[PDB]
């Protein structure tokens, strides 16, 4: 097999890259290897499509505006069982596979957790043999490349397709028209949506290999193209051709907002674009099937469509439009079938994230969908009036339309009424969703609302990113854990095995040494090998409280400066993440962190006790490097704000201990591992509510806590910005008068908890014993467990 | 060519079938149960490209190892057409691929018809570049084509309510299996900014950057081991406000390579066009210099790289003035970047460049406003001014008392808005200037650039155009190619002058019938196409009378239309009188902004409607406006043609190349003594062409006298009738005034003297009809045309450029 891989590599270099080795580039070698690897899954890819056609399993369609896929080469090698043989083949060719792997651009087609969940799910669904396709947009530009210039974030275009993508296949044959604008006529042959502008949707297919099985599923991503046909309704010829750019702009760039709604028309076009192309494709495949007594009675027995957040909410009225206006089904039948087809996953309760589209905007762009939405709402409110004749406010609360001045469509409400199942993403969150946020809806339909706790794939997030740990675990308990991560509980038998604990520590140490080389190469800071790696990587947000971590960094710095001879447990503090470009406070927080880092790293009285890195361009491939090197994972969102989290799970699986609040899935991590094996601190959700009731006065904490006062005064008075002493005035103002996330209220408990972490870190046996308990309890957080639950309780499909 | 018989030939076919199936599977990722005809086309295309990779690599190695002098053909246009069949033929793989595809149960014609034209040109100029690439590869020259990878080539033409409409030519929609992107050779191109004159010298600063990403297409020689390269540049925004809008605004940089300017023989001074011209020049020159420095002739001294040997290792041909900015750009690189003394840099520049002039029509001449150039390319304006100053200083020295000569010879047109005469820039910056046919090159030398050729009497040359006999005989007319080979062997393909051996069959009635049979087969096949696309019943015994070329006043499709109406009126006047039946086909694109050309199309379609539907005419006369004329369609209609219409006003068509294609493929020519028509008459004998009308001196005499169109209208009853019908609404009854603009032009503003050639043209046409009634005489004349067409091989043309301009040797 090694010999044939080398032969295949050389054939691709020659015929595919059209290069003699004398003038080949590193990129050429990457592409030759990529093609060699892709070739190994084509047979199963084709045979999987045949199998689904032949056997007609119910299909699952995961519809998302985001797929945060990272790099594909190593993941594909691992899932096909080819990694070791490819490593050896490339070595024999006089190359280094790790160098080739670094050439590949991330498919950064998402913002954070939501998009990464979609990615993990694809992997899990393929590994479980489900007839599942991911449907999304092939953005020409993904999440921006982040650079730091003078300590500030600057954005560069993520031109990930510049040199091509060997992991996609365009299928222009399957191109479909999407309509916009136009007008509606209610004719005696049905409602017609006419005089529209057309944009074509060209699909690109990327293979999704199951881990060591026969399944290769598909991620189909749509790209926007201008139509070619002359219309009699049709100026400068050259400008007309250039203006084709306007249609093509629909798939140009991912909106870089994490947990934040921006009601831009282009974003609405993206949402409808993906929905319209996807539903047409699904219906085409259904009609071509052996199920293709009218045509669509079997549709929800053959089709499940999962809505990833409310971003593809328009799928609901689009399916109704197709059923009623095109296929001529009665409204009642169409609506029955629609509800049985769709399920909706809610990912946040933060109000700034909620999608509320102005009715005037929807009327202009999608007049027929607005009609359909108004009719869904009418039939919905008619029911509520029937059940609660007197409750006028309940009608207001439950309407899909918010009438308060500027009328807006509540897309979450649309998703709830149009779906048979609604789930949150962690127990704490799903409860809030059910019993608070959508109380009025769950009361009327109790069985609709569910929980499906998030998860992560142990292929990318253990086998790939941490082969040392994966190997060590395999050596002790075999490799069944890869496909059933609950098998990690067997590691509990090795508590008290001191040789094993040393082996476990050595794996972490090797990871840290490797990541330290990266850090020294990229940042030219000298890393203390014996320091605790204290890491907070996630999107920059007020709710995630990178700011709270920064206060702790400054607290540590001041303690060292005040007592230089005192025992200090050394740390490398790493904070990274992107800020949404329009998010002013997040950008200020990045500048604060880089400003602190500059002072701390260059103070000769501090030296190797404490180094601070703002980790630039945080993304999936970089997550894979830092996570395995981490000792302490920071998961410190205000209680009630992080729906689940998944970075938390990645760190747990990779041998880090967690400092965190009782928020999102942190709560379930504590349940699985034991609360005493996490560093839990701070206000619980009820404590936060009590402070809201009483009223939050940040000044009181600043006055009462001397260490906080010095930290805040330093920030406020130019200690970290001597050339611009008032630089951080907006942060200070926010902290004292507009802090929705109560940073000062958790500061004391946070610092005391951090003190306990440092104490435990001085005791390697105790530390590593606690680590083992975390790894051994991490099995619940496999996305294979998550997908099995969706399959059984939402989609009604069986792993195969 | 590769055998399909015996042990080895069976294996050749077997390997091709295996490769096809491998590509369908691994490349297209399709089970045959779901494969489309397009999938099969791509699987074959990939297979065929695989078969030239070895030679392509070994060609590059050979040029590196032996360092022959390289020829770089720099053009804004490469009108390449389809590549699959051309490549199969040149590699000797057509028979084997045909057999493989047949054994797979597929129709290779259907697969071939899937391919989009690479329509990256407007007409003759762009197609000449394409023929040249084929010939340069066939002759083993170390030659690359350099151009722009337009996302959209020449628009697709449709006819709606009788008018041209344009659709975007989205030729890359399904991908291009021929090209290979080369990311690592990306180069920056600079725009705007300003010039700083400092202690360290002149710097061009504060510029905007656009990246140029090259894509390589293989250019296989006919039956040799050479595969040359066509490198086409694509514009990208650099890597490095509303964030979203900043990302969308990257479209502005990428717009530089978005679309081919669809003007044929017409200058439109648009800023985007100037950007295109600089883009291709800047990326190309950087790439050429990089290759030179990497070569065995690359060496460094105290200043750095010695460029002394540069013009011994590099020739750059400027296809028209479109890449004229190459001259000041090479000077900019030499002087500003490499720090060469101006004098030395200018000497090297002149020895490197040669310029081909393609037209003397004034509306075609590039004259860029200096203010536009100052804005976009401020350093190039400075360099152009300095070239002009030193140029005029020499003229002052030689002709101290001739002030008007300075005005005439300046690169700058000073009157009103100052403009740069790009032709003048090309002449002074080049060591050789050539026109494209004897008559044209003489006008260029002795009239248009008289002041320059007097000063430098050896600079000016002629290189008569040619066409490749691969695409334009072997490929498009296999029936004729086979017949010729049966009679005289297959050595004509590489030495087309061997066609004179066909004179052995003068008076051989068996051969003359064979020639007619080939034409008839072509006509029947093409008639099937016409009846599928058009509501017409084609008379299979009719003469196919064809005028296909871009729509222009100078090319006089309008004159042809007057003859069509004349024929119609004769039939109506005397329905029982004998009439030699014709199918009149006129085709070509109009530039979208060219009002008169668009009116002429509408006239032709309006006439067609009347003629085709008049029951008194019936099968005597049918008229077709052939839509979307382009290279692949030219390959179909040309071999089906009996009479080739080449009727430009004397002095206006620099050469023409359609004329040559028709001659090679067994049509007789009706034409004026213009461009290469004059040379076709020389080769075949003037008595074997239907030559008519004013010659160039007659046109000059009429200009001097003053042209009064109404005199012809009053003197020629048949013309009067035609014009009155057009003017009065006979061809536009629902809109009687529709053709007012055509009538006004013809009477008061006709620079091309349509009425002045009408009488001679119609009389000449009468002679054609008479000959067509005598198949033996007709086909005897055809034989004499085919037999004399050897001069018009572009292999002959390229050998002359090689010897007399580039100083390179066929290998
Ligand atoms: C087939 C082909 C066509 C165009 C360009 C390339 Cl890069 C390729 N591939 C390729 O293999 N090129 C060469 C192979 C060689 C093999 C042995 C010895 C020399 C070789 C040179 C090339 C080659 O194309 N070199 C390019 C060039 O001549 O354009 C060279 C390389 C680096 C900088 C400048 C030019
Ligand atoms: C690997 C792959 C992934 C996605 C799409 C395709 Cl077209 C391919 N290639 C492919 O060969 N697909 C199929 C092969 C089959 C072989 C035997 C029997 C049935 C097969 C079906 C497919 C296939 O993908 N068909 C598509 C589909 O299921 O998406 C089908 C075809 C035409 C209209 C609608 C759907
Ligand atoms: C896992 C992951 C996330 C989500 O992290 P959280 O801490 O749960 O917000 C975001 N970005 C990347 C690149 C990830 O891999
Ligand atoms: C050969 C050719 C031309 C040039 O034709 P002329 O009659 O010489 O102007 C123009 N267009 C196409 C498609 C051609 O093949
Ligand atoms: C709208 C949005 O991006 N929500 C995010 O979704 C992911 C995946 O469910 C959660 O882990 C995270 O807590 C939450 O902030
Ligand atoms: C500017 C331009 O396109 N000129 C054209 O060039 C071709 C190629 O030489 C000639 O055959 C033709 O007569 C001439 O009109
Ligand atoms: C105020 N604000 C923003 O303005 C913002 C954002 N994310 C993106 N943007 C622009 N978030 C989370 C936010 O709170
Ligand atoms: C007047 N005119 C035009 O306007 C024109 C053209 N070709 C393109 N355009 C726009 N020609 C040849 C022309 O003579």
Curated annotation (Swiss-Prot), chain A:
It is found in: Cytoplasm, Cytosol. InterPro entries: Glycg_phsphrylas, Glyco_trans_35, Pyridoxal_P_attach_site. The modification N6-(pyridoxal phosphate)lysine is found at residue 650. Allosterically regulated through the non-covalent binding of metabolites, being activated by AMP and inhibited by ATP, ADP, and glucose-6-phosphate. The activity is also controlled by post-translational modifications including phosphorylation and acetylation. The record marks 133 as: May be involved in allosteric control. Its EC number is 2.4.1.1. The record marks 86, 120 as: Involved in the association of subunits. AMP binds at residues 20-22, 53, 284. GO terms for molecular function: AMP binding; ATP binding; bile acid binding; D-glucose binding; glycogen phosphorylase activity; identical protein binding; purine nucleobase binding; pyridoxal phosphate binding. It catalyses: [(1->4)-alpha-D-glucosyl](n) + phosphate = [(1->4)-alpha-D-glucosyl](n-1) + alpha-D-glucose 1-phosphate. GO terms for cellular component: cytoplasm; cytosol; extracellular exosome; extracellular region; ficolin-1-rich granule lumen; secretory granule lumen. Keywords: Acetylation, Allosteric enzyme, Carbohydrate metabolism, Cytoplasm, Disease variant, Glycogen metabolism, Glycogen storage disease, Glycosyltransferase, Nucleotide-binding, Phosphoprotein, Pyridoxal phosphate, Transferase. The modification N6-succinyllysine is found at residue 333. Pfam families: Phosphorylase. It is linked to Glycogen storage disease 6: A metabolic disorder characterized by mild to moderate hypoglycemia, mild ketosis, growth retardation, and prominent hepatomegaly. Heart and skeletal muscle are not affected. This is Glycogen phosphorylase, liver form. It comes from Homo sapiens. The gene is PYGL.
UniProtKB/Swiss-Prot annotation, chain B:
GO terms for cellular component: cytoplasm; cytosol; extracellular exosome; extracellular region; ficolin-1-rich granule lumen; secretory granule lumen. It is an enzyme of class 2 (transferase). Acetylation, which is up-regulated by glucose and insulin and down-regulated by glucagon, inhibits the glycogen phosphorylase activity by promoting PPP1R3B-mediated recruitment of phosphatase PP1 and Ser-3 dephosphorylation. Phosphorylation at Ser-3 converts inactive phosphorylase b into active phosphorylase a. Dephosphorylation of Ser-3 by phosphatase PP1 inactivates the enzyme. SUPFAM superfamilies: UDP-Glycosyltransferase/glycogen phosphorylase. AMP binds at residues 31-33, 64, 290. Its EC number is 2.4.1.1. One of its GO terms (molecular function) is vitamin binding. Changing residue 776 to Q: Decreased glycogen phosphorylase activity. Keywords: Acetylation, Allosteric enzyme, Carbohydrate metabolism, Cytoplasm, Disease variant, Glycogen metabolism, Glycogen storage disease, Glycosyltransferase, Nucleotide-binding, Phosphoprotein, Pyridoxal phosphate, Transferase. It catalyses: [(1->4)-alpha-D-glucosyl](n) + phosphate = [(1->4)-alpha-D-glucosyl](n-1) + alpha-D-glucose 1-phosphate. Changing residue 776 to R: Decreased acetylation. The modification N6-succinyllysine is found at residue 344. Its main location: cytoplasm. The modification N6-acetyllysine is found at residues 450, 776. GO terms for biological process: glucose homeostasis; glycogen catabolic process; glycogen metabolic process; necroptotic process; response to bacterium. Changing residue 450 to R: Decreased acetylation. Allosteric enzyme that catalyzes the rate-limiting step in glycogen catabolism, the phosphorolytic cleavage of glycogen to produce glucose-1-phosphate, and plays a central role in maintaining cellular and organismal glucose homeostasis. Homodimer; enzymatically active. Interacts with PPP1R3B; recruits the phosphatase PP1 which dephosphorylates and inactivates PYGL/glycogen phosphorylase. Belongs to the glycogen phosphorylase family. It is linked to Glycogen storage disease 6: A metabolic disorder characterized by mild to moderate hypoglycemia, mild ketosis, growth retardation, and prominent hepatomegaly. Heart and skeletal muscle are not affected. This is Glycogen phosphorylase, liver form. It comes from Homo sapiens.
């Amino acid at each position: 097999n090694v010999a044939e891989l080398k032969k295949s590599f050389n054939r691709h270099l020659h015929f595919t890259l059209v290069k003699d080795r004398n003038v080949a580039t590193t990129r050429d070698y990457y592409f030759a290897l990529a093609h060699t690897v892709r070739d190994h899954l084509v047979g199963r890819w084709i045979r999987t499509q045949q199998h689904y056609y032949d056997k007609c399993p119910k299909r699952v369609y995961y519809l998302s505006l985001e797929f945060y896929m990272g790099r594909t080469l190593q993941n594909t090698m691992i899932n096909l069982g080819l990694q070791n043989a490819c490593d050896e083949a490339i070595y024999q060719l006089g190359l280094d596979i790790e160098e080739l792997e670094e050439i590949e651009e991330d498919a950064g087609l998402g913002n954070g957790g939501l998009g990464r969940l979609a990615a993990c799910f694809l992997d899990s669904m393929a590994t479980l043999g489900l007839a599942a396709y991911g449907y999304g947009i092939r953005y020409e530009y993904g999440i921006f490349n982040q650079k730091i210039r003078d300590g500030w974030q600057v954005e560069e275009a993520d031109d990930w397709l510049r040199y091509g993508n060997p992991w996609e296949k365009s299928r222009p044959e399957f191109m479909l028209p999407v309509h916009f604008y136009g007008k509606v006529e209610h004719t005696n042959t049905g409602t017609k949506w006419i005089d529209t502008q057309v944009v074509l949707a060209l699909p690109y297919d990327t293979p999704v290999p199951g881990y060591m099985n026969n399944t290769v599923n598909t991620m189909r991503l749509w790209s926007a193209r201008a139509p070619n046909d002359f219309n009699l309704r049709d100026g400068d010829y050259i400008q007309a051709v250039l203006d084709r750019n306007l249609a093509e702009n629909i798939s140009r760039v991912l909106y870089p907002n994490d947990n934040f709604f921006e009601g831009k028309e282009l974003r609405l076009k993206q949402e409808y674009f993906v929905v319209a192309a996807t539903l047409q494709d699904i219906i085409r495949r259904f009609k071509a099937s052996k199920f293709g007594g009218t045509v669509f009675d079997a549709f929800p027995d053959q089709v499940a469509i999962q809505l990833n957040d409310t971003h593809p909410a328009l799928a609901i009225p689009e399916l109704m439009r197709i059923f009623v206006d095109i296929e001529k089904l009665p409204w009642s039948k169409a609506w029955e079938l629609t509800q049985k087809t769709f399920a909706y996953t809610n990912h946040t309760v933060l109000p700034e994230a909620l999608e509320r589209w102005p009715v005037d905007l929807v009327e202009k762009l999608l007049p027929r969908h607005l009609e359909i939405i108004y009719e869904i709402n009418q039939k919905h409110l008619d029911r509520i009036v029937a059940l609660f004749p007197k409750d006028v406010d309940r009608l207001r609360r439950m309407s899909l339309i918010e009438e308060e001045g500027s009328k807006r469509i509540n897309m979450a409400h649309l998703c709830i009424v149009g779906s048979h199942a609604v789930n949150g993403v962690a127990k704490i969150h799903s409860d809030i969703v059910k019993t608070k946020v959508f109380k009025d809806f769950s009361e009327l339909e109790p069985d609709k609302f569910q929980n499906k706790t998030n998860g992560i794939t142990p292929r990318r997030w253990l086998l790939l990113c941490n082969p040392g740990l994966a190997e060590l675990i395999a050596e002790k308990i075999g490799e069944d854990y890869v496909k059933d991560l609950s098998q990690l509980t067997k590691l509990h038998s090795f508590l008290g095995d001191d040789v094993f604990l040393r082996e476990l520590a050595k794996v972490k140490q090797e990871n840290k040494l490797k990541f330290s080389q990266f850090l020294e190469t990229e940042y030219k800071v000298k890393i203390n090998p014996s320091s605790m790696f204290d890491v907070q990587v996630k999107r920059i947000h007020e709710y995630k409280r990178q700011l709270l971590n920064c206060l702790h960094v400054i607290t540590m710095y001041n303690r060292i400066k005040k007592d230089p001879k005192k025992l200090f447990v050394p740390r490398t503090v790493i904070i990274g993440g992107k800020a949404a470009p329009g998010y002013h406070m997040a950008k200020m927080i990045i500048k604060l962190i880089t400003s602190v880092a500059d002072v701390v790293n260059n103070d000769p009285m501090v030296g190797s006790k404490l180094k601070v890195i703002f980790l630039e361009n945080y993304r999936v491939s970089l997550a894979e490097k830092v996570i395995p090197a981490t000792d302490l994972s920071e998961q410190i969102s205000t209680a009630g704000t992080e729906a689940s989290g998944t970075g938390n799970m990645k760190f747990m699986l990779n041998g880090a201990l967690t400092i965190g609040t009782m928020d999102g899935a942190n709560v379930e991590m504590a349940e699985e591992a034991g609360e005493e094996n996490l560093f839990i601190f701070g206000m619980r959700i009820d404590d936060v509510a009590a402070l809201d009731k009483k009223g939050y006065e940040a000044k009181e904490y600043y006055e009462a806590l001397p260490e906080l006062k010095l930290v805040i005064d330093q920030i406020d008075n130019g200690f970290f910005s001597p050339k611009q002493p008032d630089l951080f005035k907006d942060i200070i103002n926010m902290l004292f008068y507009h802090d929705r996330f109560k940073v000062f209220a958790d500061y004391e408990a946070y610092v005391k908890c951090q003190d306990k972490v440092s104490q435990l870190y001085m005791n390697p046996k105790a530390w590593n014993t606690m680590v083992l308990k975390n790894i051994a309890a991490s099995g619940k957080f496999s996305s294979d467990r998550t997908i099995k639950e969706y399959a059984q309780n939402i989609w009604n499909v069986e792993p195969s």
